[PDB]
Amino acid sequence: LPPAYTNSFTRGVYYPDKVFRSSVLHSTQDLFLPFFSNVTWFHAIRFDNPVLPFNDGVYFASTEKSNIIRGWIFGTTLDSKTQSLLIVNNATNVVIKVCEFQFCNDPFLFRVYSSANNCTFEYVSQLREFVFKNIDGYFKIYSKHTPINLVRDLPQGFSALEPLVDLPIGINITRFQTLLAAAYYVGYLQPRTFLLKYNENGTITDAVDCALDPLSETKCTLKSFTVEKGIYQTSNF
Amino acid sequence: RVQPTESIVRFPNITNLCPFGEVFNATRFASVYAWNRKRISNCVADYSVLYNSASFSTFKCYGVSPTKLNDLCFTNVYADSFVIRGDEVRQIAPGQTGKIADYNYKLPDDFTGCVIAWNSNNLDSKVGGNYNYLYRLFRKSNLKPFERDISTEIYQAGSTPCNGVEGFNCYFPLQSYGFQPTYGVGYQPYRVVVLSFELLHAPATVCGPKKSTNLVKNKCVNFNFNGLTGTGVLTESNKKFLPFQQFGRDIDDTTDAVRDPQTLEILDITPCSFGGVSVITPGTNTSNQVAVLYQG
Amino acid sequence: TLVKQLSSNFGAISSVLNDILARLDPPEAEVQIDRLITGRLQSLQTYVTQ
Ligand SMILES: *[C@@H]1O[C@H](CO)[C@@H](O)[C@H](O)[C@H]1NC(C)=O
Ligand SMILES: *[C@@H]1O[C@H](CO)[C@@H](O)[C@H](O)[C@H]1NC(C)=O
Ligand SMILES: *[C@@H]1O[C@H](CO)[C@@H](O)[C@H](O)[C@H]1NC(C)=O
Ligand SMILES: *[C@@H]1O[C@H](CO)[C@@H](O)[C@H](O)[C@H]1NC(C)=O
Ligand SMILES: *[C@@H]1O[C@H](CO)[C@@H](O)[C@H](O)[C@H]1NC(C)=O
Ligand SMILES: *[C@@H]1O[C@H](CO)[C@@H](O)[C@H](O)[C@H]1NC(C)=O
Ligand SMILES: *[C@@H]1O[C@H](CO)[C@@H](O)[C@H](O)[C@H]1NC(C)=O
Ligand SMILES: *[C@@H]1O[C@H](CO)[C@@H](O)[C@H](O)[C@H]1NC(C)=O
Numbered sequence: 059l060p061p062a063y064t065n066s067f068t069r070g071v072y073y074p075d076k077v078f079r080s081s082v083l084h085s086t087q088d089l090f091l092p093f094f095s096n097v098t099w100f101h102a103i104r105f106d107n108p109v110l111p112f113n114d115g116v117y118f119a120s121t122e123k124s125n126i127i128r129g130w131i132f133g134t135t136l137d138s139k140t141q142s143l144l145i146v147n148n149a150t151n152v153v154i155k156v157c158e159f160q161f162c163n164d165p166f167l168f169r170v171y172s173s174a175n176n177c178t179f180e181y182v183s184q185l186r187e188f189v190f191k192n193i194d195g196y197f198k199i200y201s202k203h204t205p206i207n208l209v210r211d212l213p214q215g216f217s218a219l220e221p222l223v224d225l226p227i228g229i230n231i232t233r234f235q236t237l238l239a240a241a242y243y244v245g246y247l248q249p250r251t252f253l254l255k256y257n258e259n260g261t262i263t264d265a266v267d268c269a270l271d272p273l274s275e276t277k278c279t280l281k282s283f284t285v286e287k288g289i290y291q292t293s294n295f
Numbered sequence: 296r297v298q299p300t301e302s303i304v305r306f307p308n309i310t311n312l313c314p315f316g317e318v319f320n321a322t323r324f325a326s327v328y329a330w331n332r333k334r335i336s337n338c339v340a341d342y343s344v345l346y347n348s349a350s351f352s353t354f355k356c357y358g359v360s361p362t363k364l365n366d367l368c369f370t371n372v373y374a375d376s377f378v379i380r381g382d383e384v385r386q387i388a389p390g391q392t393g394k395i396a397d398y399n400y401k402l403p404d405d406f407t408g409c410v411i412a413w414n415s416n417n418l419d420s421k422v423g424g425n426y427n428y429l430y431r432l433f434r435k436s437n438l439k440p441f442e443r444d445i446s447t448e449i450y451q452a453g454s455t456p457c458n459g460v461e462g463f464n465c466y467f468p469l470q471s472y473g474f475q476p477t478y479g480v481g482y483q484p485y486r487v488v489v490l491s492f493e494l495l496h497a498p499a500t501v502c503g504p505k506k507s508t509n510l511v512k513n514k515c516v517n518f519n520f521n522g523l524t525g526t527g528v529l530t531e532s533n534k535k536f537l538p539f540q541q542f543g544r545d546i547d548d549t550t551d552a553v554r555d556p557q558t559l560e561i562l563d564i565t566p567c568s569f570g571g572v573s574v575i576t577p578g579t580n581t582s583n584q585v586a587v588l589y590q591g
Numbered sequence: 592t593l594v595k596q597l598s599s600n601f602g603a604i605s606s607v608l609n610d611i612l613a614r615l616d617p618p619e620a621e622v623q624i625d626r627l628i629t630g631r632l633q634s635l636q637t638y639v640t641q
Contacts, residue, residue, distance in 0.1 A: 076498070078536055078543040078552060221539050226334060226371070259535060358604070359614045367614055405604075495610070524609040548598045 059106070062099040066091065066212060066245060070117040071254070071265050072189055072200040072219035079256045083281050085268070086254065089191060089247040091117045093267050097212075097245040102126070102238055107164065109136075109235040115247030116234065118188040119212065126240035128167050134232055136161040138175055141229045143197070146170075146237065154181040156227055166238045179227060189219055191247070195228025212243060218262040253278050297567040299526055302517040303508050306368070307556045309500070313338035318374055324415075324486055327377040328399055328431045328469065329445050335372045337500050341365070345411070352485070353384065356409030359494075364409075368502040368522035370493035373408075378419065378428055380472070381483045384412050398434040403441070408491035415486035416476065425474035428484065433468035441491075495522060498541055510555070515567040520553050527564040536561050593638045601630030 070091030097117075100106050110116075112132065120127055133142035138158035146153045148167075156179040160172035189200040200219040236242065253266040268278035276290050277283060313335050325331045342364040346354065354361065379387070379395060386396040389404045419425055433450035449457040450468050457465035474484050499521055512529045534543065534552055543552025543561075554561050568591075575586040598606050603623040605611060611620050611627075 073539075076540050076542070078534070078540045079545075080534070082546055220537070260537070360616045362616070363614055494614070524613070547594055 059101075059104060062101075063096055064099050064212060064243070066093070066095050066097050066243075067214035068093050068216055068265065069119070069212070070187070070189065070219070070245065070247075071216065071252075071262055073221065073262065074254075076221065078260055080260045081258050082256050084254050084256065085251060085278070085281070087249070087251045089115050090250050090252055091245050091247055092250060093270060095245055097243050100242055100244065102240040102242070105164075107166070107236060107238055109233050110244055111246075112190075112231050112234045113246055114249075115189065115191045117245035117247065118190070118236075118242065119186065119245070120188075120240075120242035121185050121206070122240065126238065127242065128237040130234055130236055131159075131161065131165065131170075132229075132231055132234045133159075133161075134230055136233075136235075138171075138173070141178070143227060143229060143231075144170075151183040153183075154179075154225065156180070156229065165235070170237075179225075181225075185213070187217065187219060189247075192231050195226065197225040197227045199223055199225075216262075216264065251278075253281070255283065296569050297515045299515045299517050299567075301511060301514070302519075303510055304505055304519040305510065305556050306502050306505055306507050306521065307500075309337065309339050309502065311338040313340050313501075318376065318488065321376065324376060324378045326427075326429045327379055327395070328429055330375055330377040330400055330443060332443075333374045333376075335374055335501070340369070340372070340501055340503050342503070349413075351411050351413045353412050354409065355388075356490075358405075358407035359409070361409065365503040366505065367494065368499040370496055370499050370501075372490060372492040372501060375489040375491070376486075378415065378484055378486055379430075381479075381481045381485050384485055384487065387412075387487065387489065394432055395430070397437045399431045399438065401438050401440045401442070402489075406491065407494060408489065410487065410489045412485050412487035414483070416480075416483040419484040419486075420474050420476040422475065422477075425484075426471040428472040428474070429469050430472060431468060432470050433466060507557075512562075518564075521556055523550065523553070525550070525564065527566050530563045530565065532561040532563040534561060534563075593634065596631070596634040599630065602626045 074086045074088045098110075100108075118130075128148070129144070129146040131142065131144055134140045136142055136159070138160045140158070141156065142159050142161070144153065144155040144157070144159070155174075155177070157174045157177040159170070159174055162169050162172065165171075185206045186203045187201065189198075191198045199222045201222050202217060202219050204217055206213050251268045253268060254262055255264045257263045264283065266277050266283065267274050269275060272292070273285070275292055276285055279290065279292060314333075318333065342361070345351075346361055359367070377400070383393070383395050385391070386393040387400070387402065387410055388396075389402050389406050391402075419428075431444075434444070438444065447467075447469055449459055449461050449465050451457050452464035452466065455462075455464060461467060472484065502522070510529070512531070515526070515528055517524070517526055518529065532552055536543070536552070536554060541554050542550055545551050550564065552561055552563055571590040573588040573590060575588060577584075600606050603611070603626050608624070608627065611623055615623075
């Protein structure tokens with residue numbers, strides 16, 4: 059079945075750092091998901107569990123009702139010849155392992171790996187939107203869950219993403235694959251510059267792409283969400 | 296300016312000692328081409344037993360003064376250990392050339408850390424031959440900083456691709472050190488360790504020995520909060536920090552809120568009043584009495 | 592703009608003097624402090640002229 063496509067509507071905005079602000083505008087230069095992006099749509103229910111590229115960050119948005127999706131695997135070759143990463147959430151805890159695994163052809167839910175030879179890091183604990191990044195050997199996860207029942211597509215609205223955990227793993231990453239009615243979206247991040255508005259309490263309420271269309275560019279230049287009649291200078295081609 | 300009266304420091308509880316027992320007292324070192332890396336955190340780094348202890352040959356390092364080491368809160372210090380020849384100790388520096396500095400191990404230009412090297416001739420000398428140390432000699436291009444390669448393929452010097460024959464114009468990139476006690480000091484094997492770390496970019500866990508003190512409010516004091524330094528009064532805060540935020544900033548890009556690393560309470564900081572001084576006089580010809588105006 | 596000119600390195604390693612006074616002794620902190628002084632003097636002169 060050929061892949062389907064859709065458009066995200068101002069989604070994937072997370073707090074760039076751990077510094078509090080209030081009632082101020084701020085410009086940041088970091089990896090984001092561009093507005094009105096061309097995100098790929100998958101249907102897992104006929105099977106669709108393809109290994110998807112992990113270029114420099116993935117915005118993983120999944121809608122669930124019976125908790126069908128389990129986790130993700132991260133690595134390069136996934137044949138125990140190199141180092142691999144594991145994040146599995148079963149009914150009790152979120153297992154995290156960094157070992158050499160002989161991953162199976164179709165790992166679902168427990169047929170995951172044939173064997174585990176060498177292990178480096180382990181950890182055992184006691185609508186969803188996720189963002190994964192790997193910079194300077196740190197694996198960062200931003201997440202926030204919000205219920206929705208409005209439309210069967212991706213609803214349009216603005217929601218911030220709060221930092222959850224940072225795992226000092228520091229491995230080489232190029233590919234990933236999800237661990238399995240169920241559907242999920244996959245979007246790719248890329249380096250852009252954004253403008254963020256903080257309300258009185260300190261929660262992101264709106265954003266503007268600095269380089270989407272000329273009006274948004276002028277808004278970014280003026281550092282204001284309202285622009286009056288006139289002519290303004292932007293840049294040089 | 297209202298002169299600050301007291302000084303306070305706030306650090307969390309740290310009791311573990313950094314795992315330097317297996318770093319400097321290591322019984323064996325790894326090959327330099329496949330250099331070792333280790334992550335150190337959640338410990339107090341006492342440098343009084345490094346600079347003021349067993350004589351290390353060199354302690355060249357830039358960016359951070361060695362004396363002030365115990366007074367800073369670092370961020371995810373790194374330890375790298377390997378063995379290089381005595382002539383090769385000079386190559387471990389930014390803006391350096393050489394086979395080791397270009398094909399084996401490179402440092403970034405803005406490197407902040409301390410490199411340590413000491414004599415290791417006695418423990419790494421064999422009369423029959425100490426050939427357990429391997430070094431890189433041939434590679435495609437200059438290694439990027441903080442990058443490791445362990446590929447072992449027959450290097451093609453010119454034309455006539457080797458295809459794994461190691462014939463003419465085909466040499467093995469990896470060669471073995473031969474270490475006798477009956478050699479020179481310049482050829483003597485050296486055990487060298489490299490420390491690299493960040494500074495004030497994230498919540499920190501390594502801070503060194505610094506006795507914590509009490510806290511005071513509504514008085515112009517000097518304060519140290521996880522290494523951050525500044526002058527101002529401490530007051531109760533009405534802001535609402537999220538449980539993932541540890542600092543507060545304003546339009547002026549200067550900190551105005553800070554969370555206590557012990558009581559988990561947020562504090563507001565405001566500057567001490569400075570103003571200006573003006574003198575009011577009717578002229579020295581008429582009288583000498585004057586009036587002083589402390590502005591604003 | 593005068594306020595915001597206080598967050599520029601001007602060729603130093605940090606934009607805050609409290610991080611220059613620490614982690615460094617005077618002999619090599621002096622050059623970076625000189626760079627900061629030159630930058631801030633230039634900013635002050637420009638503002639005064641305007
Ligand atoms: C998105 O990408 C697909 C494949 O690259 C393409 O067929 C489609 O026209 C693009 N745009 C939309 C709106 O789907
Ligand atoms: C989840 O996995 C962990 C470790 O793999 C195991 O200890 C635990 O019993 C599992 N729980 C369930 C409900 O399978
Ligand atoms: C990796 O596994 C191999 C084979 O099991 C073993 O010989 C080697 O010592 C292991 N290395 C590490 C670092 O665990
Ligand atoms: C990661 O692995 C891929 C696949 O071989 C490789 O092309 C890439 O250069 C590797 N990157 C690093 C940093 O090792
Ligand atoms: C800030 O939070 C308080 C309490 O949660 C709420 O009453 C108030 O409306 C919030 N402010 C804004 C601008 O949403
Ligand atoms: C190495 O061991 C000796 C005792 O054998 C001890 O005095 C010294 O402090 C140790 N050095 C390190 C770095 O642990
Ligand atoms: C440190 O110890 C004190 C008492 O010894 C305790 O109250 C506090 O919760 C501990 N942790 C921190 C972060 O201060
Ligand atoms: C000072 O005051 C006296 C008395 O008012 C006056 O005669 C004189 O001219 C004034 N100036 C000087 C320089 O004395």
